[PDB]
Amino acid sequence: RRDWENPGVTQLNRLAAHPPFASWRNSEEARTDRPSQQLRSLNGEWRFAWFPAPEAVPESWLECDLPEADTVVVPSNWQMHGYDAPIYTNVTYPITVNPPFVPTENPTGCYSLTFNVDESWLQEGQTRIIFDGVNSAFHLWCNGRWVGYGQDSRLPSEFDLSAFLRAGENRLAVMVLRWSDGSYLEDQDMWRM
Amino acid sequence: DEANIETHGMVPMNRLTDDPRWLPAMSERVTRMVQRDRNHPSVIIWSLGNESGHGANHDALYRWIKSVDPSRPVQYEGGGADTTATDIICPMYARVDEDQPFPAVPKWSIKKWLSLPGETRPLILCEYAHAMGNSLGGFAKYWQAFRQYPRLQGGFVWDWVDQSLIKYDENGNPWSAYGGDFGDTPNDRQFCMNGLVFADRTPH
Amino acid sequence: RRDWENPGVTQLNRLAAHPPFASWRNSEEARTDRPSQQLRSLNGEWRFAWFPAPEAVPESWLECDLPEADTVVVPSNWQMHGYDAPIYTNVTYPITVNPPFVPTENPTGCYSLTFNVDESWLQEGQTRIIFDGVNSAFHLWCNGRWVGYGQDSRLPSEFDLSAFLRAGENRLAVMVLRWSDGSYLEDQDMWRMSGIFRDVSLLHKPTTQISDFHVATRFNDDFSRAVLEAEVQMCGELRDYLRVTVSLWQGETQVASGTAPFGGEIIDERGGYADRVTLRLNVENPKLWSAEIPNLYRAVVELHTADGTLIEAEACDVGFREVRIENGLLLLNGKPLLIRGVNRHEHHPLHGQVMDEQTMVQDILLMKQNNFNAVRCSHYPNHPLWYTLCDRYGLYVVDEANIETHGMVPMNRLTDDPRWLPAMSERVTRMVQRDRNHPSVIIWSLGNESGHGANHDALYRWIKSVDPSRPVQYEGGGADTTATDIICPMYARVDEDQPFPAVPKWSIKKWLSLPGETRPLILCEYAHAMGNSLGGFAKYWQAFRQYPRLQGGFVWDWVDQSLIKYDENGNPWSAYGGDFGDTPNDRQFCMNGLVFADRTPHPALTEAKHQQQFFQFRLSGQTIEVTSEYLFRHSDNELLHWMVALDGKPLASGEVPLDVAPQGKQLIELPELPQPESAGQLWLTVRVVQPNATAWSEAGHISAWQQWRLAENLSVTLPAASHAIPHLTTSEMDFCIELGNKRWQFNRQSGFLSQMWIGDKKQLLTPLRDQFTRAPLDNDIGVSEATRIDPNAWVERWKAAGHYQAEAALLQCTADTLADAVLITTAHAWQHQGKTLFISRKTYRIDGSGQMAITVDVEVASDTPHPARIGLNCQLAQVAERVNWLGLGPQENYPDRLTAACFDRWDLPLSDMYTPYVFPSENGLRCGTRELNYGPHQWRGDFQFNISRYSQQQLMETSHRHLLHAEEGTWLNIDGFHMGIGGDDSWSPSVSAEFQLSAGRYHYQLVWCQK
Ligand SMILES: CC(C)S[C@@H]1O[C@H](CO)[C@H](O)[C@H](O)[C@H]1O
Ligand SMILES: CC(C)S[C@@H]1O[C@H](CO)[C@H](O)[C@H](O)[C@H]1O
Ligand SMILES: [Mg+2]
Ligand SMILES: [Mg+2]
Ligand SMILES: [Mg+2]
Ligand SMILES: [Mg+2]
Ligand SMILES: [Mg+2]
Ligand code: NA
Ligand code: NA
Ligand code: NA
Ligand code: NA
Ligand code: NA
Ligand code: NA
Secondary structure: OOHHHOOOOOEEOOOOOOOOOOOOOOHHHHHHOOOOOOOOOOOEEEEEEEEOOHHHOOHHHHOOOOOOOEEEEEOOOHHHHOOOOOEEEOOOOOOOOOOOOOOOOOOEEEEEEEEEEOHHHHHOOOOEEEEOOOOOEEEEEEOOEEEEEEEOOOOOEEEEOOOOOOOEEEEEEEEEEOOOHHHHHEOOOEEEO | OEOOOEOOOOOOOOOOOOOHHHHHHHHHHHHHHHHHHOOOOOOOOEEOOOOOOOOHHHHHHHHHHHHHOOOOOEEOOOOOOOOOOOOOEOOEOOOOOOOEOOOOOOEOOHHHHHOOOOOOOOEEEEEEOOOOOOOOOOHHHHHHHHHHOOOEEEEEEOOOEOOOEEEEOOOOOEEEEOOOOOOOOOOOHHHHOOOOEOOOOOEO | OOHHHOOOOOEEOOOOOOOOOOOEOOHHHHHHOOOOOOEEEOOEEEEEEEEOOHHHOOHHHHOOOOOOOEEEEEOOOHHHHOOOOOEEEOOOOOOOOOOOOOOOOOOEEEEEEEEEEOHHHHHOOEEEEEEOOEEOEEEEEEOOEEEEEEEOOOOOEEEEOOOOOOOEEEEEEEEEEOOOHHHHHEOOOEEEOOEEOOOEEEEEEOOOEEEEEEEEEEEOOOOOEEEEEEEEEEEOOOOOOEEEEEEEEEOOEEEEEEEEOOOOOOOEOOEOOOOEEEEEEEEEOOOEEOOOOEOOEEEEEEEEEOOOOEEEEEEEEEOEOOEEEEOOEEEEOOEEOOEEEEEOOOOEOOOEOOOOHHHHHHHHHHHHHOOOOEEEOOOOOOOOHHHHHHHHHOOEEEEEOOOEOOOOOOOOOOOOOHHHHHHHHHHHHHHHHHHOOOOOEEEEEOOOOOOOOHHHHHHHHHHHHHOOOOOEEOOOOOOOOOOOOOEOOEOOOOOOOEOOOOOOEOOHHHHHOOOOOOOOEEEEEEOOOOOOOOOOHHHHHHHHHHOOOEEEEEEOOOEOOOEEEEOOOOOEEEEOOOOOOOOOOOHHHHOOOOEOOOOOEOOHHHHHHHHOOOEEEEEEOOEEEEEEOOOOOOOOOOEEEEEEEEOOEEEEEEEEEOOOOOOOEEEEEOOOOOOOOOOEEEEEEEEEEEOOOOOOOOOOEEEEEEEEEEEEEOOOOOOOOOOOOOEEEEOOOEEEEEEOOEEEEEEOOOOOEEEEEEOOEEOEEEEEEEEOOOOOOHHHHOOOOOOOOOOOOHHHHHHHHOOOOOEEEEEEEEEEEOOOEEEEEEEEEEEEOOEEEEEEEEEEEEEOOOOEEEEEEEEEOOOOOOOOEEEEEEEEOOOOOEEEEEEEEOOOOEOOEOOOOEEEEEEEEHHHHOOOOOOOOOOOOEEEEEEEEEOOEEEEEEEEEEEEOOOHHHHHHOOOHHHOOOOOOEEEEEEEEEOOOOOOOOOOOOOOHHHOOOOOEEEEEEEEEEO
16 A cells, blocks of 8 residues: 555554553552553664665564564664664755655665563553654554554654553564655754654 | 644745645644643644745644644744744744845844734744854844844744764764765755754853 | 545545546637537446445456446436435434444445547546546446545546556446445435436546636726636646636637746745746626626636647636625625525435436526525535536525534534544535636535534635635534634524524524624525425515625525335335335435425425515505615616506506616606495505516516505495395204205204205215314424424424314303394313313304304413414315415415415415425415305405315324325315414424414404305
C-alpha cells in the first residue's frame, strides 16, 4: 500500500490522542507525581540496521534479529550514529518536490527490541505502546505480527498491544522511513534527520 | 505551542495549505496537539504552524481551535502575518521604523502596522533580531518601541541555540560543523546557526 | 485492508473534484451546450451478481463474467430489481451502531461491463471513468487490475483509466458494498438502498488541460455594472505559448472576452500559481438572474495556443446575481427574498433513487406552477442535471453536503470527533468544488441532523473562506449555532414555543428578537405534510409577511417516498416501511409529501399554492388593491378576472389588465353591480390569469385568487301554504311519520331515526346517529404504536377516554303533533364505564312540505379530551354519481386548511370526494357548506361534510388504501364542527387551540329534504 506516499493515510490502527497519562493505581502517587508502576520506559539498548529503501528489508527481520544489526541507544537519530548524513537545507526541500511522492531511495531504519512483559499486564486490562517521536513515518510489528502505522514526527503515536504480547519475552520491529508524504509538511529550517 | 506544519519550499507557499486534499493531514497535526497539550498552564497561545503561506485549511483549523478551546488565542504568521487566521499580528522580521513593502505580504514598520486602517489587534513578533553570528545590532530599538506602545507586546528572538553539530577531526578532535559539512548537498551552510548561545550553551 | 471499515480512508486513487466537464474540441459546441464526442455514457446493460458479503466474491469475477450473473440496467438500485430489500428506517441506524464497523453480512453488488474503447482515446490524452453515484462504497478494477476505491454515495467518483485500457474490448469490475463507514454519515430519513444509481461515463481530456475553473460575478451598488471573474487552472506541461481565453455570450452575441497566458498574481513570499490565471471581464447593464427571470449568459473557457490552435474548451451557464446578508436580511440582487421553498428528496416509486430528466422537469414545473421559488437538496448533493434545470427554469437552491448522523447518541458524537473531520470534510469540500458555478445555488448547507460539533465550525469557516458569495447554513445543535449565517429551525411553530432542553424550538417570531440575535430566519423544514395535513399553513405565511426577518421556509416535503408493489393479478400498489419485510422500520413516516409518488397532488398542495401567491389584495368598497410581491418583474403576463355571484349564481364578471411594478400596488375600480333581486350572500372572487404561455406554464394559468363577501340579503319572506299535515303513528317500539310518498321512522328503543322512505324505497342502511370521532389522521397518531404507546398523542387520549367505544344511552324520546308538523325530541348520553362524555339533545321537526328540520345541542364534559368532531352519520342506501354542494371547494378542506378553497357551487363525481392517502384516515371533508346534494337528497344548513363508500370504521381499521373496499350504499358524515388536522409536526400534538373543540356546548341545525 505504500502508505507513505499517500497524504490520505497518516496512520493505521493508531489510538486517539490525550493528555499525559500514567494509570496510577494509588491516588497518593498520582497526587505527588511519583513514578507509576504502570508506565514503563523502553528506552535503552535496541537493535538497528540501516537499509537504502523499504524494498530492501528482508521479511526474516519480522521474526528474527538480523545478525548484521548493531546494538544502539534509543532514542536517537540514526544520522548521529553515522549510518547516513544529516542534511542542512533551509527552504528548498531536501527531496524533489512532487507531492505526494518521495524518492525510491528512501533511507529506512529497522529498529527492534526484545523485552519482557509481566504476566499481570496481560491477565487484565490493556497494554499499549507509545512512540513519543518517530521521524518521519513507520510501520510497527509485534512478535512477527503487524500492528499499525503512523505519521507526524513530533507527536506521540500509540498502539494497543494487548492482543499481540505474551508473558515473558516479546520482540517489536519498527520500520522507520526517512521520507514520507508527511515530509511535505515538515519543511522547517533545521537539520533533516 | 505550534503545530508541526511547515511547507516553506512549495511554490507558492500555500500550495498544499490551500488544497482541501491536504486538509486531513494538516488537521491531525493541529488537533492531536491540542488534545495532548491543552491542560498545560504554560501554553498560553496556539500556533497553526509556520511558513506555509495562508490557505483555506488554516482558516478552518483556526476555527476548530477557537471552538474547542476558547481559553487561548490562536496565532499564525503565514500569508502576511495579519490574516483572518490569526488573533495576533505576528510578523517575522518586521523592522521598528522601516517599512518593507513586499508585494502581497509586506512587512510594515511594527509601529505603523498597528495603526493601519481598521486594525486593532495586538502585535507580537513571532521572530525578530536574527542572532546569526555577530548580530543583534539594533536590538535596543525594538525594546524601546515595545515599551512605548501599548499594543506592541514584544516578541520571540530567532533563536535560542546554534544548530551546529559535533564532528571529529582525523585525530579525534571535536569541532563544530554546519551545512555541507557532512557531504550534504544542496545545503544552506551556516544558516543553521542563529542562536544567542553556541550549541554547548556557552553564551554568544 | 477492509477500507470500508476505516473512516480514515474515503477513497484510493480518486481524482480531484471539479465542475461539470465535457472536453469539447470545438468552441461552438461548447458555447451552445451540444453533446461532446469526448464525453461518452456507459449507461445501459451491465452484468450483475449479488453476494451476501465481500468475502464471498470469487477471484474469478475479476477477469471473467459469472455465468450466474444477470444482465441489468445501470443506473439502478439493486433493491429495485429484487435482489434484496430496501429498508425504511427514519432515525435509528439500519445497522448496529458500532463505528466504524459494519455488519459482516454486508450485501455486495458485483457489477461488470464489457465495452469497447477506440484506440484513438489511448493514443494520447487521458481517459477517466466517472461514477456519479455509487451507494455506499466501492472498489474498481479494469481488465482485472485494481484501480481504486471511493465513498460518499452522492458525489461523483472519478479515476484515470489511461494506463489500464487496451484498444478494443475492456472489462470493468465494480464491487459495491451496501454498508461502509460512510454509512455512519448517511443516516437520512429515507429508504436505505444501494448500487450504481447515478450515471457512469467515460471522459477524454488532453494531457494539457483545463483542470478547474471558478466563475464569480461582482456588481456595483445598483447592479448596473458587473465584473465577471474566471479563475482557471490547468494540469499538464506548462509552455509559454499556452493561453486561456474566457468569452461571455448573451444568446448569440459575444458581450466580452479576455485572453492571457498562465501565471497568476503573486500570492506570497514564494511567488504565485504558474498553473493558473484569472480573467476579468466587465459587463455593463447585465441581465440579472433570479427565480423570477432566470436570465443566463454563457461563459466559454478555451485552452489554446498563442497562434490560435484550440486545445480544449469547457463552459458553463452564468447567472449574474449577488447573494448577501445585510442588516439581518437575506438579499438577492439587493432585495429581500421571501422563500416559498420545499425540501425534495430524489425518489421514484418504480426506480427507487435513480433520477431521470423527465421526472425532474415534471417536479420543477409542478413546483413553479404551485408558487414555489426554492428547493432544498434534502440532504445530499443531487444528480448534476438538477442544478442545470434550476438555473434555467429559475429556482433558488440550497445545496447540502451528504452528512447525516441522526441515530448517534448524542447526535454530535461523530461531528465533534476530530477523527471524523476528514470524512466530513470531503462531503463538504467536494460538493463545493462541483457545484460552485451554478447560479441557482444561493446557500450552502453543512448537512442535516448531526448535532453541532467542532467539525461543523471548521467546515463552515472553510466555505466562508473559499466561496464568499453564498451564505452558509446548518440547523443541527439548535438552529442558531456559530456554524450558521441563518437561523434555520425545523418545525419551530409560529407563536408557540417548544422549550426543549439544550435545543429549544422557540416561536419563530420570538426567536428573531432573542437578546443579541440579529440573523434572518428561514425554516429549513416546516409544515410536515404527512397524510391529511398542512393544518395551520396560513399562520406561517401571515407571519412571514408581517416580519421582515422571517424570510420563509422549505416545506417538508415534496413527494411521498412510497414504493410500487404488485398484487396477484399484477395491479400495482403503494408500499411503505415494513412492506418489504424490512424491520425494524418506521412505517408510513416515509410519506410526507405535497404530492403522491406518481406526482398526483395531495389536496394540501393547493393550500400551499394559495398561501405562496405573489399578489396580495385588499378590498374597499368598489376598489380592489393589488400589491405585487415580485422583487424584480413587472406583472407583464397577468390580467385580473373578477366575478360576482349570488349563492353560486353568476351575477356579473369582468377582466382588467394588471400593470403592477415589483413591490408596487395597483387600484382597480369595479363598476356598479346590479345587486341581486333576491336573498343570499353575494361573493366576489378574483383570479390572476397568465394569458401567455411560459416555459413552465400554459396560457391561461391561474397564479392567484382571493374572495370576499359582498352584500348579504337575509331572507325574511316566509310564504307558501300548509299543504298537508304529517301523520304520526305510535307503537311501543316506534314513532312513525308519513307525508305523501315519504315516511320517517324513529326507533323508541334507541332514540334514532332508523329508516326513511321515499315511495316504497328504504333509504338508510344504518340509522342516523351522532358521531364524535374520526378515523385518526397521521397527525392524530404521531409516533404512537400498539407496541409503544404515546399517551400524549390525540388518538391515544381519545382511546383512553373511551371515545371510540362510547355507548349511547337513551335519556328521552317523545313525539308531539303540532298544528302543521310532527315534533320528535331525543336526548342521549354517551358514556364510558360510568363517565358521561357527551350529551346530545335534538329535535326533529317534520312539516307539511316534507322537510325535516333537525336541531342538535351537544354538551362535552370539560374533562374529557376535546373530540375530533361533533356531527351525525349514516349509511345511505343509495349510490349516486355526482355530489353537488354550495360551499368551500372544490378540493378537500379542513378548518385549519381551507384558505385556498372558494365558496361557490361545486359538482363532482363521487370518487372525487374521497382522497386516497396511502395510509387511510378521515378524508374528503369540505367545510362551510350551506347545501349539499346527493341522489334525491338535500341537506341545508352550515356544516362540514364528507361522503364516500368507506366507513370511518373501515378507514380506521385499514393501513393501506389498496385494501379498502366500497361498502354498500354511501357513508355520509355531516358535522356541525370538526377539529383541525394540524401538521406543524407529525410527532406531537400540533392542532392549534383555536381549532380544538373546547367550547363545552355546541349547536348546529340541519334541514333534510328530498328532491
Ligand atoms: C533566508 C530567508 C529568505 S527565509 C528565513 O530564513 C531564516 C534562516 O535562519 C529563518 O529560517 C526564517 O524563519 C526564514 O524566514
Ligand atoms: C419523528 C421525529 C423525532 S424526527 C423527524 O422525523 C421526520 C419524519 O418525517 C423528518 O425526518 C424530520 O426531519 C425529523 O426531525
Ligand atoms: Mg501517508
Ligand atoms: Mg522556513
Ligand atoms: Mg473507509
Ligand atoms: Mg433524520
Ligand atoms: Mg436533452
Ligand atoms: Na508595549
Ligand atoms: Na536558520
Ligand atoms: Na418577511
Ligand atoms: Na419522513
Ligand atoms: Na399584465
Ligand atoms: Na387508517
